Write an enzyme that holds these catalytic residues in place. Sequence first.
Site, PDB file in Angstrom:
ATOM      1  N   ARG A   1      13.451 -30.826 -12.295  1.00 42.29           N
ATOM      2  CA  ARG A   1      12.466 -29.984 -11.620  1.00 42.29           C
ATOM      3  C   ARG A   1      12.702 -28.516 -11.981  1.00 42.29           C
ATOM      4  O   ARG A   1      13.765 -27.960 -11.699  1.00 42.29           O
ATOM      5  CB  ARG A   1      12.516 -30.192 -10.111  1.00 42.29           C
ATOM      6  N   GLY A   2      11.708 -27.914 -12.631  1.00 41.60           N
ATOM      7  CA  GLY A   2      11.792 -26.534 -13.111  1.00 41.60           C
ATOM      8  C   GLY A   2      11.493 -25.529 -12.018  1.00 41.60           C
ATOM      9  O   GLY A   2      10.367 -25.465 -11.509  1.00 41.60           O
ATOM     10  N   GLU A   3      12.500 -24.723 -11.689  1.00 45.51           N
ATOM     11  CA  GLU A   3      12.499 -23.885 -10.488  1.00 45.51           C
ATOM     12  C   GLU A   3      11.485 -22.730 -10.475  1.00 45.51           C
ATOM     13  O   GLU A   3      10.805 -22.515  -9.471  1.00 45.51           O
ATOM     14  CB  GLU A   3      13.918 -23.371 -10.221  1.00 45.51           C
ATOM     15  N   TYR A   4      11.372 -22.007 -11.585  1.00 46.88           N
ATOM     16  CA  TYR A   4      10.576 -20.781 -11.611  1.00 46.88           C
ATOM     17  C   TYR A   4       9.203 -20.954 -12.238  1.00 46.88           C
ATOM     18  O   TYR A   4       8.207 -20.452 -11.714  1.00 46.88           O
ATOM     19  CB  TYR A   4      11.374 -19.649 -12.263  1.00 46.88           C
ATOM     20  N   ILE A   5       9.154 -21.663 -13.360  1.00 46.82           N
ATOM     21  CA  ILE A   5       7.887 -22.026 -13.985  1.00 46.82           C
ATOM     22  C   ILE A   5       7.656 -23.522 -13.719  1.00 46.82           C
ATOM     23  O   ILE A   5       7.994 -24.380 -14.543  1.00 46.82           O
ATOM     24  CB  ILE A   5       7.842 -21.649 -15.504  1.00 46.82           C
TER      25      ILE A   5
ATOM     26  N   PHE B   1      18.561 -23.197   5.066  1.00 47.36           N
ATOM     27  CA  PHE B   1      19.858 -23.789   5.357  1.00 47.36           C
ATOM     28  C   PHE B   1      20.555 -23.173   6.567  1.00 47.36           C
ATOM     29  O   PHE B   1      21.529 -23.738   7.072  1.00 47.36           O
ATOM     30  CB  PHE B   1      20.777 -23.760   4.124  1.00 47.36           C
TER      31      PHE B   1
ATOM     32  N   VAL C   1      22.347 -15.829   9.059  1.00 41.13           N
ATOM     33  CA  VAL C   1      23.484 -14.915   9.076  1.00 41.13           C
ATOM     34  C   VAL C   1      23.299 -13.961  10.254  1.00 41.13           C
ATOM     35  O   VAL C   1      22.229 -13.366  10.416  1.00 41.13           O
ATOM     36  CB  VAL C   1      23.663 -14.114   7.745  1.00 41.13           C
TER      37      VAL C   1
ATOM     38  N   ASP D   1      23.306 -13.748  -8.543  1.00 40.85           N
ATOM     39  CA  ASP D   1      22.495 -13.265  -7.440  1.00 40.85           C
ATOM     40  C   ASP D   1      22.672 -11.771  -7.301  1.00 40.85           C
ATOM     41  O   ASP D   1      22.497 -11.207  -6.223  1.00 40.85           O
ATOM     42  CB  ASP D   1      22.867 -14.022  -6.144  1.00 40.85           C
TER      43      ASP D   1
ATOM     44  N   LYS E   1      21.782  -8.116  -7.266  1.00 35.20           N
ATOM     45  CA  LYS E   1      20.599  -7.308  -7.021  1.00 35.20           C
ATOM     46  C   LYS E   1      20.978  -6.209  -6.051  1.00 35.20           C
ATOM     47  O   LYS E   1      21.990  -6.305  -5.361  1.00 35.20           O
ATOM     48  CB  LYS E   1      19.439  -8.149  -6.453  1.00 35.20           C
TER      49      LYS E   1
ATOM     50  N   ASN F   1      21.928  -7.012  -2.479  1.00 31.45           N
ATOM     51  CA  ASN F   1      23.221  -7.674  -2.291  1.00 31.45           C
ATOM     52  C   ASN F   1      24.452  -6.776  -2.472  1.00 31.45           C
ATOM     53  O   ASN F   1      25.595  -7.255  -2.536  1.00 31.45           O
ATOM     54  CB  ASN F   1      23.299  -8.924  -3.180  1.00 31.45           C
TER      55      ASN F   1
HETATM   56  C1  0R4 Z   1      33.840 -26.686  -4.060  1.00 30.28           C
HETATM   57  C2  0R4 Z   1      33.240 -25.324  -4.282  1.00 30.28           C
HETATM   58  O1  0R4 Z   1      33.174 -24.495  -3.370  1.00 30.28           O
HETATM   59  N1  0R4 Z   1      32.797 -25.128  -5.537  1.00 30.28           N
HETATM   60  C3  0R4 Z   1      32.263 -23.971  -6.036  1.00 30.28           C
HETATM   61  C4  0R4 Z   1      31.297 -24.048  -7.051  1.00 30.28           C
HETATM   62  C5  0R4 Z   1      30.739 -22.870  -7.561  1.00 30.28           C
HETATM   63  C6  0R4 Z   1      31.137 -21.621  -7.076  1.00 30.28           C
HETATM   64  C7  0R4 Z   1      32.110 -21.538  -6.073  1.00 30.28           C
HETATM   65  C8  0R4 Z   1      32.541 -20.198  -5.559  1.00 30.28           C
HETATM   66  C9  0R4 Z   1      33.881 -19.917  -5.226  1.00 30.28           C
HETATM   67  C10 0R4 Z   1      34.263 -18.650  -4.744  1.00 30.28           C
HETATM   68  C11 0R4 Z   1      33.290 -17.655  -4.598  1.00 30.28           C
HETATM   69  N2  0R4 Z   1      33.262 -16.351  -4.193  1.00 30.28           N
HETATM   70  C12 0R4 Z   1      31.986 -15.871  -4.283  1.00 30.28           C
HETATM   71  C13 0R4 Z   1      31.517 -14.500  -3.924  1.00 30.28           C
HETATM   72  C14 0R4 Z   1      30.524 -13.855  -4.678  1.00 30.28           C
HETATM   73  C15 0R4 Z   1      30.102 -12.584  -4.306  1.00 30.28           C
HETATM   74  C16 0R4 Z   1      30.678 -11.950  -3.195  1.00 30.28           C
HETATM   75  N3  0R4 Z   1      31.643 -12.555  -2.465  1.00 30.28           N
HETATM   76  C17 0R4 Z   1      32.102 -13.785  -2.751  1.00 30.28           C
HETATM   77  N4  0R4 Z   1      33.071 -14.366  -1.976  1.00 30.28           N
HETATM   78  N5  0R4 Z   1      31.239 -16.885  -4.776  1.00 30.28           N
HETATM   79  C18 0R4 Z   1      29.898 -16.905  -4.947  1.00 30.28           C
HETATM   80  C19 0R4 Z   1      29.040 -16.494  -3.906  1.00 30.28           C
HETATM   81  C20 0R4 Z   1      27.649 -16.539  -3.997  1.00 30.28           C
HETATM   82  C21 0R4 Z   1      27.057 -17.055  -5.136  1.00 30.28           C
HETATM   83  C22 0R4 Z   1      25.544 -17.105  -5.227  1.00 30.28           C
HETATM   84  N6  0R4 Z   1      25.131 -18.346  -5.856  1.00 30.28           N
HETATM   85  C23 0R4 Z   1      23.927 -18.395  -6.405  1.00 30.28           C
HETATM   86  O2  0R4 Z   1      23.087 -17.561  -6.115  1.00 30.28           O
HETATM   87  C24 0R4 Z   1      23.557 -19.447  -7.397  1.00 30.28           C
HETATM   88  C25 0R4 Z   1      22.261 -19.970  -7.347  1.00 30.28           C
HETATM   89  C26 0R4 Z   1      21.862 -20.948  -8.253  1.00 30.28           C
HETATM   90  C27 0R4 Z   1      22.748 -21.388  -9.228  1.00 30.28           C
HETATM   91  C28 0R4 Z   1      24.032 -20.862  -9.286  1.00 30.28           C
HETATM   92  F1  0R4 Z   1      24.869 -21.323 -10.240  1.00 30.28           F
HETATM   93  C29 0R4 Z   1      24.454 -19.883  -8.374  1.00 30.28           C
HETATM   94  C30 0R4 Z   1      27.864 -17.487  -6.193  1.00 30.28           C
HETATM   95  C31 0R4 Z   1      29.248 -17.419  -6.090  1.00 30.28           C
HETATM   96  C32 0R4 Z   1      31.913 -18.009  -4.967  1.00 30.28           C
HETATM   97  N7  0R4 Z   1      31.601 -19.245  -5.428  1.00 30.28           N
HETATM   98  C33 0R4 Z   1      32.659 -22.717  -5.558  1.00 30.28           C
END
Ligand code: 0R4
Length: 376
Positions: free
Chosen positions: A12-16, A117, A120, A217, A219, A222
């Site tokens: 499933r294509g998210e944006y287009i 989901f 906050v 993410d 921007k 954020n």
């Molecule tokens: C088991 C598990 O938790 N797995 C997992 C998989 C992928 C990423 C993470 C992970 C771990 C520590 C993290 N710390 C941050 C973080 C980042 C910025 C500011 N403070 C933070 N604490 N992240 C984190 C947080 C938000 C995101 C936003 N995600 C997306 O918008 C997204 C949307 C679609 C696809 C995609 F790959 C990512 C990504 C990573 C983190 N992601 C953990």
Amino acid sequence: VAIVKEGWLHKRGEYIKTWRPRYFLLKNDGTFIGYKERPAPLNNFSVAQCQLMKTERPRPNTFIIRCLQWTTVIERTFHVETPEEREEWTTAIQTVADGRVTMNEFEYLKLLGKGTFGKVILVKEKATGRYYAMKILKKEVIVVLQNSRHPFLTALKYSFQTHDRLCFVMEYANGGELFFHLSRERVFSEDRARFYGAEIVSALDYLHSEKNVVYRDLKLENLMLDKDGHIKITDFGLCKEGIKKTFCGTPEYLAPEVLEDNDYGRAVDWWGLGVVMYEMMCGRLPFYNQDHEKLFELILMEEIRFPRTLGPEAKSLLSGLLKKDPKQRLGGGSEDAKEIMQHRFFAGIVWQHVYEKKLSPPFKPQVTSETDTRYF
Ligand SMILES: CC(=O)Nc1cccc(-c2ccc3nc(-c4cccnc4N)n(-c4ccc(CNC(=O)c5cccc(F)c5)cc4)c3n2)c1
């Protein structure tokens, strides 16, 4: 190391909006990537700890990989031609997947964000008078953690659970949102932008390098400021793909390869950094249109016209960060963040000093303590 399953899947294509065929590889590490044609890993695309679900709506033989990634719910939806094909994929994915406080402790002050989901909420811990953000995820909608040792990411203070909820109490900076500061100031100077850019690069280098994680993410919304004027990158994602914009994320900041819905990696964060720094330095977005389809076309097809006000270092960096082909983009090679760290725009920056908060902020927000509610 080794491929466990390979073959075509409708994704499933998210944006287009489309069901586009992608050639996917499931690997023994947990990696599950889909390339446009038959072709370092990222935990974002892993199936480790994910939940697998069979459905017949909207299309027959559909399946969903739902993951809790840190504090955020991430979903990808797939379709195949027959039920035997599904059971082949779902069993292969399933087998590869191999590995204090309560609500009562807090006062609930202000809604900060809401999505499919959850919510906050701006919260105050009774015992300390400290302000935090509680991210509250609905268990009904989704159906053991160690923080990053980096100062500009959002650290998790508490994690707990009720019968119907998952609760993450996380840092919330009291120095204001950068979108607010930039709205008022109209434009940042190149040195102002250099400082924020360096702090962003340092945090994302850490995510990419130590955690094997893309943020995806980035921007202006954020990005918030410390009481001291340092950066805080926010972790407030609540959005669900496919329901009312029907896609998640702010399209003005999304990389071309995310829009195309191919494989992508670390370089999507550098494209995001480019938009953000462009906006701080020009006072406007590099790509904008009211209409999302036209905006998408611009991101994918149009080259940027850089304002004449921009010095040659800034222009070189922004042109590097906003190349459409990710393998050509600044930071897009094997070196990742290092490419950006040694670009000329950041001449003089000591990167260990950035990491240690030793860089002096060009701007201090009007706040006397970490308990000052002025910006709330
Ligand atoms: C088991 C598990 O938790 N797995 C997992 C998989 C992928 C990423 C993470 C992970 C771990 C520590 C993290 N710390 C941050 C973080 C980042 C910025 C500011 N403070 C933070 N604490 N992240 C984190 C947080 C938000 C995101 C936003 N995600 C997306 O918008 C997204 C949307 C679609 C696809 C995609 F790959 C990512 C990504 C990573 C983190 N992601 C953990």
